[PDB]
């Protein structure tokens, strides 16, 4: 039950700006400034039968109205979720709540999402109030202070115990709440927010999200209290968005400070589409619009781009000597042996010239220095990646490409991703405007562009899921039930609100169903079922025809083929150009489908003209987003695309004359002309190659399949409906109903799955795995094997527990165990490592054997699991790196041993440190003294030199 849904407009004036246009962007007011406007939205989720008085009349006991409303709620003692951009001023709301609790002699808690941000907030809060303390997973300081900044992860472990500190706690402030949707660590936020006391109030600070009300309602239902939302797209530093068509000299304003899309400038920008980074930085330098961040999505793209900046220097020798002193002082924190590291020496010349690199591969010391030198204005252009929460604002931000790389494809940047990165432009006070520039290399459609630069932010969708360590922890605690979590998870709340919108689609879907009725239903249905059976068997022969054994012999150059990639995009009839085996340079010996085992280059004449074909890779058949068959009434351009065999609908009996160099100039045009002729001489269609007479497929099972088809056709030819004039008419009326009926049956089950509690079956399945492995008794009373799994959190709690109790680490050496545990701390992918020596392959196979024993139990317990996928999820590629690091090898030796970036090695070593420290504490509970001495020797062996070095 909701109410009080008023919007209110707030206007202000800012200095005028022509930006990069040779003309003013917005009509200036009489005062010589430009008037802007933003909207502040408010709603409240009320619990049933609650005495509520509408806001905009609260009295308090340099502010924006979105702060005034949110503060008014805090003054009234009701929870509030604030949604606004990164610089909009949300911290003003947290400070009021942190103050209102002090003036009442009450305690307030503050949770920070990522690492050090709490520690910096700890120091920042002391200066503002004094009566503040810090509690964290790493260190613990001052609990007795009135206010306490605390890690979010530490709070979840603290609420299971029920430390009763909440006795005199009035407000819990969650900063950057939208991290609750993180697929890896988002479950924690939901867990802690579920376990909050109903008597405590909350202040939720989140970025711009559309579904802010779904979160407030969820708060309202769980904790039986009203919950407000305050939303505003308000951008404090106004932004200007430009498009830079590649290889051109143009710059076009596509959307301005009022978020209005400039149509004419766009079509001009697209007209120009027919080095580049160098031009844009030199422009921004001469126009004094620095600092700049040029975002690349790959770590190598950043370093390569900065290398292309070899010519320019942005710093005077006084500044070059200045930053070099800061650089050298920070390097001093490293051991003298690591101060001559190649990554360190090679980056200094770039820094002296005023150009910086910032990516996850950097050493922890270097990343920190580069961040500071950029703050000091010593670095004028920063080559960075999307992954950053840091305070690194620049006044102009540039994107290398208009597309982001997906796991296997190049996808268009999403509306949200543009919002999250354009926000890195503009600085409060310093800059009158923020500039974002996007280099585009494709004749993108208008509606696609509006969806990007003017799109909407991502929704805050729950990522709650059951965990084995979570379930075991709930068994030790007597007060909270796993069923209770599911019933209160934001996930469950999102399903119970989904079924009324699904029921509307269902009742609408059946309205079309009742209105359809086909005469002679029995005869029409039989004809439909037979044709469907024929459709199925004929698709089955296609797989036999397209299989490499039979197809490859007939895939000569010029062969005519019908292309239907992924059963969706139909390119019509084309000509085979060449074919070769698929090898997968990355992650070799990867399994391929028999039909996907080969890649065929085919010429097509139905490609949409403005499709960006320049993105095509020679052996990557995943067609990038935007490469599509020409729609009706659209121009066609000849091109060559790669396809797997599954993308062939039928193989032709004809074959063209192909030039030696199809890549030559105007050759695709001449072949496209011949394709037009073959398509013209055969308007009804191209004859296919006969599988038995022509292709000589003689397999006996194949012959039985063909006979199964012939039977249904003569069966079809003897149906009463075959000789009817209304056949096409009476069949479409039925086939439209059958599709509807299958759609309705799908939705009928979909609502059933959401009618019950979510993953309630999954909870019973996980518990079955625990009882089977011996982690709890057949009556789910916790066992010792289960108790030790509660202590493990930096890795697979089940497998690490089974390895410890099975004595796998007993027969090993400390250098061997460290390499084994490396498979539990390295999650990112890398190049396949060389074959392991027998000293490291034996404990690996000894763990892979236990892993399969677990995977089979998960599959047998009815959990959706691929056995092969699970065993390979424990990356062993760094085993030799960790092993030699323990044997005394230097950091310079192990870096030349893998393609993993230096910073990533540091992160996993430290992540391995955290895991080994957990197994040390576990040896105390299990009472295994031999294991304690083992893991401690492992920790001292890893913790040396660079990994042991500290931060600034």
């Amino acid at each position: 039950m909701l109410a009080d849904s008023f919007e209110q407009e707030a206007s202000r004036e800012v200095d005028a700006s022509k930006g990069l246009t040779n003309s003013e962007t917005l009509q200036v007011e009489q005062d010589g400034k430009v008037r802007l406007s933003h909207q502040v939205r408010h709603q409240v989720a009320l619990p049933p039968n609650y005495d509520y008085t509408p806001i905009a009349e609260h009295k308090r006991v340099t502010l924006d109205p979105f702060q005034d409303t949110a503060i008014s709620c805090i003054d009234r003692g009701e929870s509030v979720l604030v949604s606004a951009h990164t610089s909009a001023g949300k911290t003003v709301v947290a400070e009021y709540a942190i103050a209102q609790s002090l003036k009442n002699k009450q305690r307030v808690i503050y949770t920070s999402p990522i690492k050090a941000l709490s520690n910096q907030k700890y120091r920042e809060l002391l200066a503002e109030f004094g009566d503040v303390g810090l509690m964290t997973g790493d260190i613990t300081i001052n609990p007795d202070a009135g206010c306490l900044v605390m890690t979010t992860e530490i709070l979840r472990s603290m609420l299971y115990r029920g430390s009763e500190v909440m006795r005199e706690v009035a407000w819990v402030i969650f900063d950057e709440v939208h991290y609750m949707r993180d697929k890896e660590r988002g479950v924690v936020w939901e867990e802690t927010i579920i376990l909050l006391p109903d008597k405590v109030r909350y202040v939720f600070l989140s970025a711009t999200i559309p579904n802010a009300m779904e979160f407030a309602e969820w708060i309202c239902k769980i904790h039986s209290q009203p919950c407000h939302i305050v939303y505003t797209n308000f951008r404090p530093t106004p932004l200007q968005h430009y498009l830079f068509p590649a290889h051109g000299d143009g710059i076009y304003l596509v959307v301005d400070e009022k978020s209005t899309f400039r149509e004419e400038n766009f079509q001009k920008a697209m007209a120009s589409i027919s080095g580049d980074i160098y031009k844009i930085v030199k422009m921004i330098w001469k126009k004094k619009y620095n600092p700049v961040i040029v975002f690349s999505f790959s770590k190598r793209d950043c370093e390569e781009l900065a290398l292309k900046m070899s010519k320019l220097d942005f710093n005077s020798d006084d500044e070059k000597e200045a930053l070099t002193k800061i650089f050298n002082n920070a390097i001093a924190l490293l051991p003298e042996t690591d101060r001559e590291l190649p990554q360190i020496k090679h980056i200094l010349p770039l820094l002296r010239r005023g150009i910086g690199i910032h990516h996850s591969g950097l050493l922890p010391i270097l990343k920190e220095v580069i961040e500071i030198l950029f703050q000091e204005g010593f670095l004028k252009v920063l080559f960075a990646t999307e992954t950053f929460g840091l305070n690194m604002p620049a006044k102009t931000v540039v994107f290398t490409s208009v597309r982001k790389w997906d796991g296997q494809q190049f996808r268009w940047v999403s509306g949200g991703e543009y919002i999250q990165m354009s926000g890195r432009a503009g600085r409060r006070g310093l800059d009158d405007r923020g500039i974002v520039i996007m280099m585009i290399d494709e004749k993108m459609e208008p509606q696609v562009a509006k969806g990007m630069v003017k799109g909407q932010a991502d929704r805050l969708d729950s990522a709650f899921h059951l965990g084995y360590n979570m379930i075991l922890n709930l068994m030790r605690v007597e007060g909270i039930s796993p069923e209770f979590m599911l019933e209160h998870s934001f996930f469950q709340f999102q399903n119970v609100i989904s079924v009324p919108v699904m029921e509307k689609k269902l009742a609408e879907l059946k309205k079309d169903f009742d209105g359809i009725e086909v005469e002679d239903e029995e005869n029409v249905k039989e004809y439909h079922e037979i044709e469907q059976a024929i459709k199925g068997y004929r698709e089955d022969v296609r797989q036999v025809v397209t299989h490499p054994a039979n197809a490859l012999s007939f895939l000569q150059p010029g062969r005519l083929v019908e292309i239907s990639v992924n059963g969706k995009d139909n390119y019509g009839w084309g000509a085979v150009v060449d074919f070769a085996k698929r090898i997968n340079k990355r992650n070799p010996s990867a399994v391929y489908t028999d039909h996907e085992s080969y890649i065929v280059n085919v010429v097509v004449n139905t490609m949409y003209i403005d499709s960006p074909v320049n993105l095509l890779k020679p052996f990557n058949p995943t067609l990038p987003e935007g490469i599509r068959p020409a729609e009706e009434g659209e121009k066609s351009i000849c091109a060559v695309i790669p396809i797997t065999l599954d993308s062939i609908k039928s193989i032709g009996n004809l074959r063209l004359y192909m030039p030696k160099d199809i890549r030559a100039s105007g050759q695709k045009e001449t072949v496209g002309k011949s394709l037009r002729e073959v398509n013209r001489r055969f308007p009804d269609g191209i004859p296919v190659l006969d599988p038995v007479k022509n292709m000589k497929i003689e397999d006996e099972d194949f012959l039985k399949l063909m006979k199964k088809i012939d039977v249904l056709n003569t069966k079809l030819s003897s149906n009463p409906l075959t000789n009817s004039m209304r056949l096409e008419e009476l069949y479409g009326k039925y086939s439209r109903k059958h599709d509807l009926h299958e759609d309705m049956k799908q939705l009928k089950r979909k609502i059933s799955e959401s009618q019950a509690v979510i993953q309630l079956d999954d909870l019973r399945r996980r518990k079955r795995v625990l009882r089977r492995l011996g982690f709890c008794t057949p009556n789910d009373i916790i066992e010792l094997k289960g108790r030790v799994a509660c202590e493990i959190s930096s890795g697979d709690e089940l497998l690490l527990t089974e390895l410890i109790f099975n004595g796998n680490f007993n027969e090993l050496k400390p250098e061997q165990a460290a390499a084994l545990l490396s498979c539990f701390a390295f999650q990112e992918r890398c190049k396949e490592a060389p074959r392991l020596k027998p000293e490291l392959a034996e404990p690996l196979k000894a763990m892979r054997e236990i892993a399969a024993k677990i995977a089979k139990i998960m599959k047998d317990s009815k959990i959706e699991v691929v056995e092969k996928d699970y065993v390979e999820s424990f990356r062993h590629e760094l085993m030799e790196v960790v092993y030699e690091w323990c044997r005394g090898a230097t950091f310079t030796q192990i870096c030349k041993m893998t393609d993993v970036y230096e910073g990533s090695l540091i992160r996993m070593f430290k992540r391995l440190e955290e895991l080994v420290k957990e197994l040390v504490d576990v040896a105390n509970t299990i009472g295994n003294s031999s294991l304690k001495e083992k893991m401690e020797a492992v920790l001292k062996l890893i913790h040396r030199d660079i990994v042991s070095a500290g931060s600034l």
């Binding site: 012999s553 007939f554 010029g558 074959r655 073959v678 022509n694 000589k696």
Partner: peptide, 12 residues
């Protein structure tokens, strides 16, 4: 003309 009809499969 611009092509030929081919029904034989190379490499047996």
């Amino acid at each position: 003309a611009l092509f030929h009809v081919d029904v034989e499969g190379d490499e047996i």
